[PDB]
Nucleic acid binder design. Structure first.
Ligand SMILES: Nc1ncnc2c1ncn2[C@@H]1O[C@H](CSCC[C@H](N)C(=O)O)[C@@H](O)[C@H]1O
Lengths: 76, 321, 107, 84, 98, 93, 84, 98, 107, 93
DNA sequence: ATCGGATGTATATATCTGACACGTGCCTGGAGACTAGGGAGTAATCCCCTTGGCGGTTAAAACGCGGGGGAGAATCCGTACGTGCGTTTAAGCGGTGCTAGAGCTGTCTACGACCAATTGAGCGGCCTCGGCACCGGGATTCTCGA
DNA sequence: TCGAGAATCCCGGTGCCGAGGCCGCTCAATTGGTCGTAGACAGCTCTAGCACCGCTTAAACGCACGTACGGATTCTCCCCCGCGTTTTAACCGCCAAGGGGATTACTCCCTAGTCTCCAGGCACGTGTCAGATATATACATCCGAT
């Protein structure tokens, strides 16, 4: 199915997803397709701060829907 | 005896003891009543239209009877132009926005009527002039939907400056040391009563005590957008914990500070991603540039703005060749 | 055991293994605490990062994509703090900062 | 065979000292600067070479290597980067 | 009438030429003969690695360049523009070498 | 014979702080000699700081005081910050 | 209670800078020397005291020793004999 | 008519006196208060050993009289005899401190 | 087994035992040869002998029999090579050499 | 506790070279610090010399080269002559 | 002041080239996992010595006033130094050839760390006087207006 | 072309407190062994430094000439020195408080050391691209003519 990834500067990228795979896998594909670090990104949709071990369907975001992208400083 | 003059609109009347208030190097009560009378004069044109009458240079500080005569002239004048206000004639509306020197000496009036002994403030902090935050207001452009907060307000003078001068919904001020926050709650109450005395408009604001790195304050600064600090001597750990606190701010949030958290020649690259310099644009102002009392050369209070687009174009510029 | 290098635990790029070996086999003191070579390699990696950043800026300002020694001298003699740390040193093939005294230019 | 050098301090030419002073930011050069600078350079090279030759006499060598000159200059304060 | 530049601008073009460039401004082989002549007084029939001659050259000419900077500051301080041997002697006395 | 150097590490910090540029061999050996020289300065000051207090160790604190003495001002503050950041990232591993 | 000295550099008075300059052998001292020498002495004391306080605060002490000032001067290349 | 030395020879008599003696020149308590005022900025509530401010005073007078020797050589070099702030700044710019 | 000291074996005065202990405990190298502290205490004794001889001459010229620090300063500044060795140091309560520049004496 | 010094050895060399002259306590401490500073310079140059050749020992050769490097000219000649005389007077006995 | 002629330097493009950049075995140095010992953290306690506060004395600092002498400014002179130019010269490049010496390796012996037992050198502490600090006043040597 | 006020020096006189010699008492230097290993030395290799040649040509030398500039001169104002009166803070001496340095005892964690594994980095080899060089022509500018 389809996903929208909204950036906070006003851009979206449309991507090929499976809801059965984890969101860590699609954020790895976000790394391979844009270069955003896995530690640095965080994706939220309607007050729902995602976790990497969970999948897309586990937080109930459907087809042709958008995840909002915001960044945090990585640290160690 | 006593000395009283009521508001030009008719609030609770301004009271003064017949004993002399002497406070500081430059702040006396005679100059206080002189500057307050002159700014009440400059606020309404009819007042200096009516009271040009025959009072020249011959008046001195301790000679109290000429002060009584002049203030009795002003009291008769206040009652009489109130009777001129009682007719069909419209006055100047109370809910208008004030001037700049008006707020300057209204803040110096709160400085007078609340703090008497400033060197007890030495028990350790310095003074922030109002022309600094005035040229900041010349630089910063703001709305109603954002929130103003200064962190480490001291006596809280700039809190009252922003709360009476411009229009955030909720202005905060914080102070952790016992003596300037101790004086600052009284400054809050007396500034409330002096805003009743002058009758000029001012929005919702508070003066609080606490450590602004606490767990409530973390999401509290993560709520607001407009922040002022004087971070010359906060220390390293305070500023770094505040950096990882301001990382959770929304778009367009603005910081004004003395020691800049990121130097203005910043370029982001794959080593310093953890720093807050990836988030902020840094611009420089031009204040009066003084403060020759301690160390101060010509230095500006640099403005940071949360700009998360430079990080985005760096991440997309990662795949150029 | 899966061998994870001690520079990779700290996230430094400079080695702390080699810094630890030099601190031991240089005779600075008898014992070398384990928290010291990671600290020292962080400081060396930071100073290399600052001189390389200013050198890359001075090389890209000269429209070259390669750091020549002249770009290193143009880096460390312009920043006043690196000029204070590297005050005594001669960088070979380094050149001089172009600064002529304003007395010599004619009115 | 062998060779024995009489004086080569006149080999540091007048255009060489002119070029060195032009690097320093000197506009006019008096005519005695050439003799004084040959003297100054001879004193400086005597110091660096005396320390370098001691560093290479210690190691039972007969080649003043570049590390010996770099260590001599590191001893006198003039640390030299770019030779090891 | 030939094209002649006012005395004092080929000096400034020379300054802007050599200050922006990184050559070794003394010629190499006279410096090799100077270094071998000076080194014959300390240890007879020595040899020199070529990198050591280049190290002695880069060090000696960078010292002479810094000395001419201090000398030019001395001469400008004396309200002149021409470095003179009393200016070099003053700069080496202030620096702590005589 | 393996003559070790800081070639590859200065190269990695270059490819971090400047993803385009590279470094010529003369400037490579200049940064080699610079890393060796700042190492000998900080280790010398740490050795004297260990001997002046009648200790026998170069712990992290002696390298921190050596960096506070040698590097001037803002380099001291930044290098102290980056050092203690790396040592606290190292100890929690 | 507590105290802080507001501007205490004028204890290096004009006859003190005059006496120091007469020790070095100057014959006549311009009147603008004294502000410059107070600034120079303030920078020198700031450097020596900064290194001395760092040598102390390393050792977990609150008294700047005479050994700490001697080491702070030996660090800058101004070795001081007489205090250890 | 009172007896008055010409301007210049009380200076030379002071030079001979302060050069032939070895006592300290700055008064000891102003220098101690200046050392405490400068050490206020680095760590607060610092105590000083009495020999520590004595060592700071020996070092500061030795530094200042060496700087005044250098600035006297600069002022003599400019064909003057009065030291001036140009001279002190030149000596410090040559010795490598500014 | 008569305990004949190494300071007396070489005809020196300086404590070759103490110099050996300082060379070992001071962390200069991982081992210190037996030829080291005899040589080093000889050099220290010679430099102390030259400084004390010149200071004794400078105190005898001032008709005093105690070497105070001013005589040490006159000793290390009047000689050329001790002034080159001690060029950085500031011998406390030592004063300077008495000399006025030739442009300042009246004419 | 016991704070060691070179006081009595400087006193013995003074009694050798000037049998009637004494040394005040401040000049005693100055000669103490002078002996300590010259010992630290010669041992520092000897440690650097013994490390620069990848040796491990401060022999008499290294102290001789360090004294030849630090002391200028005639002091170096007289000091290495005194040192080699004392090391031969030591090793013969 | 304005304005071209000649010059110099910068800007653009095509060329070679060699020095940088990256992939390959490989080997040795770094990581790891115990092991033991002592070095260092921590607490407690003694006591030196450092800060802070009296007052009395007075030498030194501050202020102010003539006034001479020195810094600086303006002018003038001539000469020493920059600038071209042509004439000399020797540096640089590019090869070849040698052997001297750096450098690596392979034994091996003297030598120095290490440790235990022994003792006197050198330490702190304490009398003890004498070299020098202070002092008083007179002779000597200036410095200057005569 | 010197006498007179005045510092400076010198010389005898007094007092003190720091050098200087003496004395128990540790504990660090000495001696006597043992053993591991580092350095000395022999020998072989093979880089590389010295030496030499000739060609090219960039550069150095010499030289005359003109001009800016360094140096001497004279003058002029101000400013810094010397001196005298006031004034003030240093300084000395003494006083107590108590903070923190210095020392000791204890205990355990951290690091040298060692043995084993393995991958990080280094010498080496090779492609190819950034830069150097050469050329060809636009801009910056310098300077004398009007
Ligand atoms: N944790 C904390 N919470 C609140 N105030 C703090 C703080 N740490 C320091 N501060 C205060 O920061 C102040 C710095 S002075 C700033 C003066 C005042 N904000 C003005 O602009 O006029 C001091 O009063 C100090 O007490």
């Amino acid at each position: 199915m389809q996903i929208f990834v909204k950036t906070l500067t006003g851009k979206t990228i449309t991507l090929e997803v499976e809801p059965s795979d984890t969101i860590e896998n699609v954020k790895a594909k976000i790394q391979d397709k844009e270069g955003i670090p896995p530690d640095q990104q965080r994706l939220i949709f309607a007050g729902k701060q995602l976790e990497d071990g969970r999948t897309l369907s586990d937080y109930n975001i459907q087809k042709e829907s958008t995840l909002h992208l915001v960044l945090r400083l990585r640290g160690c | 005896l006593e000395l009283r003059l009521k508001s030009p609109v008719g609030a609770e009347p301004a009271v003064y003891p017949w004993p002399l208030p002497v406070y500081d190097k430059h702040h006396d009560a005679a100059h206080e009543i002189i500057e307050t009378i002159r700014w009440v004069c400059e606020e309404i044109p009819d007042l200096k239209l009516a009271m040009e009458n025959y009072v020249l240079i011959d008046y001195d500080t301790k000679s109290f009877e000429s002060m009584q005569r002049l203030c009795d002239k002003y009291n008769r004048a206040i009652d009489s132009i109130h009777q001129l206000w009682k007719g069909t004639t419209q006055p100047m509306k109370l809910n208008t926005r004030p001037s700049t020197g008006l707020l300057r000496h209204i803040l110096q009036q709160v400085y007078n009527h609340s703090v008497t002994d400033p060197e007890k403030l030495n028990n350790y902090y310095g003074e922030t002039s109002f022309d600094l935050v005035a040229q900041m207001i010349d630089e910063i452009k703001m709305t109603d939907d954002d929130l103003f907060v200064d962190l480490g307000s001291g006596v809280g003078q700039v809190v009252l400056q922003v709360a009476a001068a411009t229009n955030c919904k909720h202005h905060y001020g914080v102070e952790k040391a016992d003596i300037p926050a101790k004086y600052a709650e009284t400054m809050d109450r007396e500034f409330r009563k002096w805003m009743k005395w002058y009758g000029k408009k001012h929005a919702e604001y508070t003066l609080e005590r606490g450590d602004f790195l606490s767990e409530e304050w973390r999401e509290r600064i993560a709520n607001t957008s407009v922040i002022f600090v004087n971070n010359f001597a906060f220390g390293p750990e305070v500023d770094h914990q505040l950096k990882e606190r301001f990382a959770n701010m929304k778009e367009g949030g603005r910081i004004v500070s003395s020691k800049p958290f990121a130097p203005l020649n910043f370029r982001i690259n794959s080593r310093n991603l953890s720093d807050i310099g990836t988030i902020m644009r840094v611009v420089e102002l031009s204040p009066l540039k003084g403060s020759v009392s301690w160390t101060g050369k010509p230095v500006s209070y640099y403005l940071h703005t949360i700009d998360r687009t430079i990080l985005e174009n760096y991440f997309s510029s990662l795949k150029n060749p | 055991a899966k061998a994870k290098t001690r520079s990779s635990r700290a996230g430094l790029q400079f080695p702390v293994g080699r810094v630890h070996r030099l601190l031991r086999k240089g005779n600075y003191a008898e014992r070398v605490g384990a928290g010291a070579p990671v600290y020292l390699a962080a400081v060396l990696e930071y100073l290399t990062a600052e001189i390389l950043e200013l050198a890359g800026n001075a090389a890209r300002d000269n429209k070259k994509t390669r750091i020549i020694p002249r770009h290193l001298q143009l880096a460390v003699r312009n920043d006043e703090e690196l000029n204070k740390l590297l005050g005594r040193v001669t960088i070979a093939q380094g050149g001089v900062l172009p600064n002529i005294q304003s007395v010599l230019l004619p009115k | 065979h062998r060779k024995v050098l009489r004086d080569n301090i006149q080999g540091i030419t007048k255009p060489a000292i002119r070029r060195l002073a032009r690097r320093g930011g000197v506009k006019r050069i008096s005519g005695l600067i050439y003799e004084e600078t040959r003297g100054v350079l001879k004193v400086f090279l005597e110091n660096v070479i005396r320390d370098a030759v001691t560093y290479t006499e210690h190691a039972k060598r007969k080649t003043v290597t570049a590390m010996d000159v770099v260590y001599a200059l590191k001893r006198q304060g003039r640390t030299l980067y770019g030779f090891g | 009438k030939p094209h002649r530049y006012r005395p004092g601008t080929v000096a400034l073009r020379e300054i802007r030429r050599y200050q922006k460039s990184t050559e070794l401004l003394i010629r190499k082989l006279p410096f090799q003969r100077l270094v071998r002549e000076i080194a014959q007084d300390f240890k007879t029939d020595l040899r020199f690695q070529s990198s050591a001659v280049m190290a002695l050259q880069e060090a000696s000419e960078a010292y002479l360049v810094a000395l001419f900077e201090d000398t030019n500051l001395c001469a400008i301080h004396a309200k002149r523009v021409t470095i003179m041997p009393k200016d070099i002697q003053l700069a080496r006395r202030i620096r702590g070498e005589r | 014979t393996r003559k070790e150097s800081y070639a590859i590490y200065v190269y990695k910090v270059l490819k971090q702080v400047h993803p385009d540029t590279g470094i010529s061999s003369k400037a490579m050996s200049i940064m080699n000699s610079f890393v060796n020289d700042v190492f000998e300065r900080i280790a010398g000051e740490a050795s004297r700081l260990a001997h002046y207090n009648k200790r026998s160790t170069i712990t992290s604190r002696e390298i921190q005081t050596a960096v506070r003495l040698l590097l001037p001002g803002e380099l001291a503050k930044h290098a102290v910050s980056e050092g203690t950041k790396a040592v606290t990232c190292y100890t929690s591993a």
